[PDB]
Amino acid sequence: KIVAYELKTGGVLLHPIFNPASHLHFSIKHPHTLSWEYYSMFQCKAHLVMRLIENRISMEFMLQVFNKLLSLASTASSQKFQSHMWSQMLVSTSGFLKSISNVSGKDIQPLIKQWVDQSGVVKFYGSFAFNRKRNVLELEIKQDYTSPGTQKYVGPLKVTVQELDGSFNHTLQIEENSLKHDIPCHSKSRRNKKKKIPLMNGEEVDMDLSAMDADSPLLWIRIDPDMSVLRKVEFEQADFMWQYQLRYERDVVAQQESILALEKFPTPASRLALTDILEQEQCFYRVRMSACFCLAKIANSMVSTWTGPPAMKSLFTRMFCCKSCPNIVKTNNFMSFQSYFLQKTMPVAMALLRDVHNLCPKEVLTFILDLIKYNDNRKNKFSDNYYRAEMID
């Protein structure tokens, strides 16, 4: 939301100094002259910058800062002196930074100078190349700092590389003149023997390594995984790396960004990846709800190649319909709250299917109308208004 708004119009400036922001058509000196979208993005950017301050100075020290502010205010709140002490209930920026420096011993003045006083987000364009001879991974990260909403980042940058030997984090120093970052790569001895490949968490899984390159061990790369800067990343992986990142990652933002990047690769391996995500309980439900729409877009792009039925129909009849009647939907029992959301989002994406004539097929429209006719809600303890409203959608 904030990178869309700041690249759209100028930027949000937390803590201006009194104009400080002349790129935008109102004055930021008073709350009653702000646009309402600017007020909403102001609150949004403020809580993300506080998450960044928690990233630099750990969460227990952050809660100690907040407790110190509240304790000064509550010793202030019981005095009777007319504001000799009642102004300890008012916080400022300098007092907040001083309380942070009191509890931690680190000051955050570079982070405050970059993300508060400066009003911009950063844009990262990354592309890699694997050097087989020296066994290194040559990243190439360049910033677009000449757009109207952007600024230049010179700090450190975390990158997480999943190779066959596991998941390794690397810190890159991205100075102004930097372009190529050579990080080292590990072995490929988990392709010699079939062993399980260890993940970002402690677990390990069986991966189908037939799509991987023979010479490179690395399975996927993620630039800034923890969202530790206010950034927009445009990484150029290969399509099998996006499919491996969709399947076997233990991070929901990486599964979402792989869904978002698989729309450019309409190959049938990506259809298999999104269909395996859709069938998979123990995936987070908002990833499967995105995989519905991604599968609809991919299915629209590979018409005159699609083999069987329309997308997600057989999967809907496998998950939510009767075993004896495929075209009759099961009676509504909405007590699971994840297959309820997936059931009410799957025909909405299924209706975006189009034939070679650019008209929605009469197999999906008839399916949606049979979902509407055979709807029986006399048996669940929950209402049907959102599911029926999504059927109209």
Partner: protein, 394 residues
Amino acid sequence: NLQEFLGGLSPGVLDRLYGHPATCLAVFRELPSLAKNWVMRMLFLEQPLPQAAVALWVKKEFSKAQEESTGLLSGLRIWHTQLLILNPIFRQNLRIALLGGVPSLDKYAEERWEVVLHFMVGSPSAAVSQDLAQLLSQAGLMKSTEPGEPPCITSAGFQFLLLDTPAQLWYFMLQYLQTAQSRGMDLVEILSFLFQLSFSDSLLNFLQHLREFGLVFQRKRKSRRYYPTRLAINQPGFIVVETNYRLYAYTESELQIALIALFSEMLYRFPNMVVAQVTRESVQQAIASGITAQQIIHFLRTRAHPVMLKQTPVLPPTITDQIRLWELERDRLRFTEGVLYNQFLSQVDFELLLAHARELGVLVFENSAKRLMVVTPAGHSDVKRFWKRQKHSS
């Protein structure tokens, strides 16, 4: 073949090459079967005729002969559709060609070719001729790299050596013509003389080279008249092969003994016989030098003593199979120049890039499973631009 040589020519050189004296007859004799008949038919016609007649003028059976003859003579451009009348110049020359307008020599040719082959091989005693040496060096079968030291023999040299005399001489003359064009000698004038044989400064030099090769011999202190030898127009065996890789060759000329020693170990040399052994060492030595088992087998078969001709096959299966297996035992490294890309993103997009390097001729190896295309540095400035254009198209 001569058909290949003449097919590899332009119309402008072809019509000029169709000289009055002989060319119209020498090229006629090339016509394998039927095109002779059609040439005779429409030798007397001044009016072109429709192609359908020629098409239907051969029965349904054996039509492939009709199409192949028509294609061959279309390549030779003997006629033109003109809408199939023959070329007027060829018609006139052919009408003028059709009722219009030694024992010591063969030995000389044999001896001259034998001494030429002796020089080709590392024979201490051989005929000396700087022009012949440089001609053989530039023919592609010899490389010197050091004028002071005598030139060595390249890999193609051994293969050329093991060929039979007819094909050997024919290929040598083909290379002679190809290098004649490079050195600037007119190709048509020299070529017409070869055709005239089977019935200027450049002419004198060419005849001198032919005499050095032994095809012709003036015999009169280099007079205008010449008496071509048998080889100019265009024998029993002596080797006996045992089942224990033993060769008994009734050879008196050192050339045959040298040729056998090229791929066999010599044991004894009698006045009218020589004993050699075909061992792994000798055979693999020849293979490394460049020969392949096919040349050795063909050489032994062609120089097969009459005694072993009765048995079928002439060459024992054990010897032939052993030679072939010995050659197979060796498989060898290669050399090329290339550059490789990576991170090709979409699959259907990588298939379009494969056709760019294949049409230009800079593609070496492709990989659709990993997306891995090797591009030679000679055309690197053209593939990258195409890739950039594709990216721009998105």
